[PDB]
Design a protein around this ligand. Structure first.
Ligand SMILES: [Ca+2]
Length: 372
């Protein structure tokens, strides 16, 4: 209720486990995820894109709030997600639909903003990298993220089963899932000898030993635009395993990997579709990317590539007076996607990876997305 040159957008939504309230939605189409510090995300009336304010994202050195895969690893996040559900997506349904969705982390499957498996889509967004950004940042600024099968499990007998939502809710009563791995659900004892309770009543557990159950969770993003090691890069990832193997690292290093030569494992491929030295990426101007994706088609339980995907990217900006359009990924056949039931959704902002704490600050704007 007081206009400034930068206005913090501090509401955050857990899109897997919670519907977005009307007052958390941004510009009618986004919700924010990651650290809620006022400076992390602001509407920027000082740097306009298409004559409208843009979104200024910033993580400072201390803003890593998240844990990485490797021990003692951290990561930092302030992003917008184009995919979330609202209370209107559940209105009129039985009350247990939303309750069980929060439990299985499937609330967002009931909302807008995801494209289907194996579909064709066009995306466009714009970014502004100021001169002030350090050439050693390690950050992803736009990504298309997958949607894991939340009730797909491996039993303690090594068999892969797709549970119903109800069956999974039952499993969760006796299994404490540490990200993707099931653990004995041990009642946690307070120092008094008594069962500890949540802040707001709920009973609290902790993981005992691995109990044999696994669930699909996480995984690399199928497409990511970022900077790392002094390079701008576009990286596409493919996972054709029905149940993702979280331990199968297959993640191409941009600086060591040539373009369009996939790094592969039995089931995964990570491909650098494009890279450019940081010094050569245009600074202090708005750059517009137009991305066409034909998502790879996978064979589900057969774990096959039914049809490879395709990626095309144009990069447009003004230089010294005129329009420049560079066809930086030219209609490339590529493996891109994940073998899941559900498809993919877009996010932009700062996703600080590779255990980096170098500050990051840049602006993003102008997203649209069309079924074509
Ligand atoms: Ca899967």
């Amino acid at each position: 209720k007081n206009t400034q040159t930068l206005m913090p957008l501090t509401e955050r939504v857990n899109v897997q486990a919670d519907s977005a309230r009307i007052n958390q939605i941004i510009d009618g189409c986004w919700v924010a995820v990651g650290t809620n510090k006022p400076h992390a995300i602001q509407r920027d009336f000082t740097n306009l894109f298409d004559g409208k304010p843009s979104y200024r994202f910033e993580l400072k050195t201390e803003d890593n709030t998240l844990e990485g895969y490797a021990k003692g690893e951290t990561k930092g996040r302030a992003e917008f997600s184009y995919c979330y559900a609202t209370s209107d997506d559940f209105k009129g349904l039985p009350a247990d639909v939303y309750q069980k969705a929060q439990i299985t982390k499937t609330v967002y499957h009931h909302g807008k903003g995801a494209c289907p498996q194996g579909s064709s889509r066009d995306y466009e967004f714009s970014v502004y990298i100021p001169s002030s950004l350090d050439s050693n940042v390690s950050t992803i600024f736009a990504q298309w993220h997958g949607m894991p099968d939340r009730t797909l499990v491996q039993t303690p007998q090594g068999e892969v089963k797709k549970l119903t939502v109800d069956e999974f809710v039952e499993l969760e009563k006796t299994t404490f899932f540490k990200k993707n791995a099931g653990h004995e659900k041990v009642v946690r004892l307070d120092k008094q000898g008594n069962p500890m309770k949540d802040k707001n009543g709920k009973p609290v557990y902790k993981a005992g030993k691995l109990n044999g159950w696994l669930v699909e969770q996480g995984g690399y993003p199928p497409l990511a635009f970022g900077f790392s090691g002094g390079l701008f890069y576009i990286k596409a990832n493919s996972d054709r395993k029905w149940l993702t193997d979280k331990d199968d690292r297959c993640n191409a290093n941009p600086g060591k990997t040539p373009v369009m030569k996939p790094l592969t494992s039995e089931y995964k491929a990570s491909t650098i579709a494009y890279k450019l030295p940081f010094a050569d990426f245009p600074k202090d101007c708005w750059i517009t990317f137009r991305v066409h994706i034909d998502w790879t088609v996978y064979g589900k339980e057969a774990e096959t590539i039914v049809k490879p995907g395709m990626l095309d990217v144009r990069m447009d900006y003004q230089e010294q007076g005129k329009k420049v359009s560079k066809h930086i990924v030219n209609n490339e056949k590529i493996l891109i996607g994940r073998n899941d039931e559900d498809g993919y959704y877009f996010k932009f902002g700062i996703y600080r990876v590779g255990d980096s704490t170098v500050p990051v600050c840049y602006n993003l704007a102008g997203y649209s997305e069309r079924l074509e």
